[PDB]
């Protein structure tokens, strides 16, 4: 006959979400070429047009320098594979500097200020092959079986 | 100036289409199992339920015995990869006796009344591996880019 | 001259992302028969559809306070010229898209 | 003199779907049958038939 009150907390992050409102820069004059990319994964630049002024990007592969991370957008993205993706032949929202949430494949929390190493598919890994100049921003969390890590980005 | 009038002819048939109103038979108490079936290709039976009465069918593979050919239906099909198919876990119209138009991979017209040889993927092809008890009904046409052939089906 | 040689329609909404249209077809045949016949041929019909997309365009310009004051005093402002240049750039981009296309954007 | 003929098929589900959506399927098949008859007549007049003399 006694009443019961309960309490629940929200999750703090989603893949490809901008971590906070610090100094950031979005490179939005790019176009997806040769396939599709995942929100929360790194991309590489294929070529930059001399006159038209659009860069050509795709998912990261072996032996390629990353350029940025795709970020969430409720308008520019299409829903496929139960998640947000960017389809081929369309404008993309690439983040080049700032704090972002990234998909992870590691199993242990990282160290603040250490260098970020990626996997061959553009996802963070504690023992990846591709080396970057980015550093960890401190965040490390999970959303319903999806691991997320907070990454600091600076311009190339 | 002098007026002009023109003339055009329709196509003859479609993949998985009933050829004529001869004595046919349709089995509609079947369900697609583990995959999808192209309209106009042969199917095989993997299991007949002892008491429930339904039959489990799937696309033809190597070293099996064909049972029938899927036919066109505007209501009980799904439009996928620009063709019309039967999807997994759904009722399927399977024709077990009569004349039907089906896909072909051959290059020359066949002989009337001779035995039909099917390919491993379930489409008719000369000098094929799988042997049936079906005979050619004398039909050799073509849609815009699809080869078709008329086959006479006898019940197993 | 691309909006003056090709028709312009105003059906799409300002908040749409894709449009689509349909097409239909049919087949069939006939034959010469006898009085006792059981194999009359049949007919059918078809359908198909297509797709199209929409794109956004943009640019910008800068100006300082000293230039604003100099334009106000000398009688020749510098901001209106830049606004005209921006409008001309947009129109020329539309014309170039119509008459030359864009390979990366399909 | 000669005779011509064909036929078409339909099911109850297709009839109901055509009534509900607004695009019936039987009218298109009837039109196809009539067009096939007319085109066969035209072919006989202008192209002829060898087995039928």
């Amino acid at each position: 006959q006694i009443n019961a009150s309960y309490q629940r907390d929200m999750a703090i992050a989603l893949p490809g979400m901008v971590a906070d409102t610090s100094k950031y820069n979005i490179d939005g004059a790019c176009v997806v070429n040769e396939g599709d990319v995942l929100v929360g994964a790194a991309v590489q630049v294929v070529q930059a047009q001399a006159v038209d002024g659009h860069k050509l990007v795709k998912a990261l592969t072996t032996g390629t320098t990353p350029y940025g991370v795709a970020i969430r957008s409720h308008w520019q993205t299409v829903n496929a594979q139960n998640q947000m993706i960017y389809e081929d032949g369309g404008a993309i929202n690439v983040m080049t500097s700032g704090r972002v949430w990234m998909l992870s494949k590691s199993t242990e929390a990282p160290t603040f200020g250490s260098a970020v190493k990626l996997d061959v598919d553009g996802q963070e890994k504690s023992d990846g092959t591709i080396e970057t100049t980015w550093t960890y921003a401190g965040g490390w969390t999970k959303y319903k079986d999806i691991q997320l890590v907070e990454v600091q980005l600076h311009q190339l | 100036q002098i007026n002009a009038s023109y003339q055009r002819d329709m196509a003859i048939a479609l993949p998985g289409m009933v050829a004529d109103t001869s004595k046919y038979n349709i089995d509609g108490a079947c369900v697609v199992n583990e995959g999808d079936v192209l309209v106009g290709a042969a199917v095989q039976v993997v299991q007949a339920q002892a008491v429930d009465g339904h039959k489990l069918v799937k696309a033809l593979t190597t070293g099996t015995t064909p049972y029938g050919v899927a036919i066109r239906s505007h209501w009980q099909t799904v439009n996928a990869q620009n063709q019309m198919i039967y999807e997994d876990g759904g009722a399927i119209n399977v024709m077990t006796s009569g004349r039907v138009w089906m896909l072909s991979k051959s290059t020359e017209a066949p002989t009337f009344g001779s035995a039909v040889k099917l390919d491993v993927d379930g489409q008719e092809k000369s000098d094929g591996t799988i042997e049936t008890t079906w005979t050619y009904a004398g039909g050799w046409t073509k849609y815009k880019d699809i080869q078709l052939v008329e086959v006479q089906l006898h019940q197993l | 001259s691309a909006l003056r040689v090709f028709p312009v329609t105003t059906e799409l909404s300002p908040t749409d992302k894709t449009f689509e249209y349909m097409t239909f077809d049919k087949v069939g045949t006939a034959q010469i028969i006898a009085d006792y016949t059981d194999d009359l041929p049949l007919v059918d019909a078809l359908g198909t559809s297509e797709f199209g997309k929409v794109f956004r365009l943009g640019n910008a310009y800068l100006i300082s306070i000293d230039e604003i004051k100099a334009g106000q005093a000398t009688g020749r402002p510098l901001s209106t010229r830049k606004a005209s240049a921006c409008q001309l750039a947009h129109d020329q981009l539309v014309n170039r898209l119509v008459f030359k296309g864009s390979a990366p954007h399909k | 003199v000669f005779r011509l003929g064909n036929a078409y098929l339909i099911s109850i589900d297709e009839i109901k779907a055509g009534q509900a959506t607004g695009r019936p399927l039987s009218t298109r098949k009837a039109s196809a049958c009539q067009l096939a008859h007319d085109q066969l007549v035209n072919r006989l007049v202008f192209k002829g038939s060898a087995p039928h003399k």
Partner: peptide, 26 residues
């Protein structure tokens, strides 16, 4: 499942005009 709040059908336009093939009789 981390989709968005709007589906495709809500931001899609269906043109109200169909095209038919032409088969003249003769």
């Amino acid at each position: 499942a981390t989709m968005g709040i709007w589906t495709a059908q809500e931001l899609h336009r269906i043109k109200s005009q169909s095209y038919e093939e032409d088969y003249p009789v003769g």
